[PDB]
Amino acid sequence: GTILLDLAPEDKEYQSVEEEMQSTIREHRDGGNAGGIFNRYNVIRIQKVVNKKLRERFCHRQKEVSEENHNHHNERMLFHGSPFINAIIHKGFDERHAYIGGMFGAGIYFAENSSKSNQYVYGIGGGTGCPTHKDRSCYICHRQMLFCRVTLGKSFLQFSTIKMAHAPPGHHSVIGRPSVNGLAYAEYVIYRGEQAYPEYLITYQIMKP
Ligand SMILES: CCN(C(=O)C1CCN(S(=O)(=O)c2cc3c(ccn3C(C)=O)cc2Br)CC1)c1cccc(C)c1
Ligand SMILES: [Cl-]
Ligand SMILES: [Cl-]
Ligand SMILES: [Cl-]
Ligand SMILES: [Cl-]
Ligand SMILES: [Cl-]
Ligand SMILES: [Zn+2]
Numbered sequence: 510g511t512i513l514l515d516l517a518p519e520d521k522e523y524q525s526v527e528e529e530m531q532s533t534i535r536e537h538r539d540g541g542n543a544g545g546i547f548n549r550y551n552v553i554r555i556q557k558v559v560n561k562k563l564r565e566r567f568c569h570r571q572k573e574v575s576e577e578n579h580n581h582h583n584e585r586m587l588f589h590g591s592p593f594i595n596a597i598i599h600k601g602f603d604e605r606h607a608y609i610g611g612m613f614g615a616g617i618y619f620a621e622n623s624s625k626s627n628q629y630v631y632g633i634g635g636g637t638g639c640p641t642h643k644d645r646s647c648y649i650c651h652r653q654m655l656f657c658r659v660t661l662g663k664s665f666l667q668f669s670t671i672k673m674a675h676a677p678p679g680h681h682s683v684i685g686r687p688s689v690n691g692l693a694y695a696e697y698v699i700y701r702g703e704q705a706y707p708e709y710l711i712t713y714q715i716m717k718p
Pocket of ligand 4: 553
């Protein structure tokens, strides 16, 4: 039931998304190992993901969370990267595919920094990089990430690794927060797929500095 609406680069909605993507790039602690060395993307395409059933599921859950959290669903626009974008835009996020070994356990991970999500596009820690050149810093091959609506509800703030299966009691999400001698950039984790909607599909390259 998914329809992808291609946005014209002249569209202000396209430009809004690209601006968020470009302006949230950060220098990463790993010197570029996972996601590559760049300070700018070349955006190839931005598509709006239209899926009535997925939207219904997302909205139903958002209403529940809102009622459970003093009428604040705390929706945030956040980036997601993984090798599973094609499945996500058709069937949604599915925590049954999330396993307990992750830094914050069996959840679906999002970032406020696009360059953090870019570290996951080819796998955890960038995997082995692009299929053709096996280069995590490939400047040739195309990449995709999502810019998603994410229902956070009441977030549990976590500063170090804790492998949990579900949000803590009374909460709807976990935020891995920067701390001294800890994380550098925030990571946002939900443990129910229906708390995210894959609003925008971005096709891009990283650019060589
Ligand atoms: C960013 C961290 N991260 C995730 O959050 C994963 C969470 C689970 N997802 S998921 O979107 O729910 C998901 C995972 C899937 C599939 C089909 C196979 N999958 C397999 C084998 O996993 C579909 C989806 Br709809 C994809 C995103 C991740 C990212 C890259 C690689 C891996 C293993 C996990
Ligand atoms: Cl416009
Ligand atoms: Cl980092
Ligand atoms: Cl193309
Ligand atoms: Cl829709
Ligand atoms: Cl897939
Ligand atoms: Zn390549």
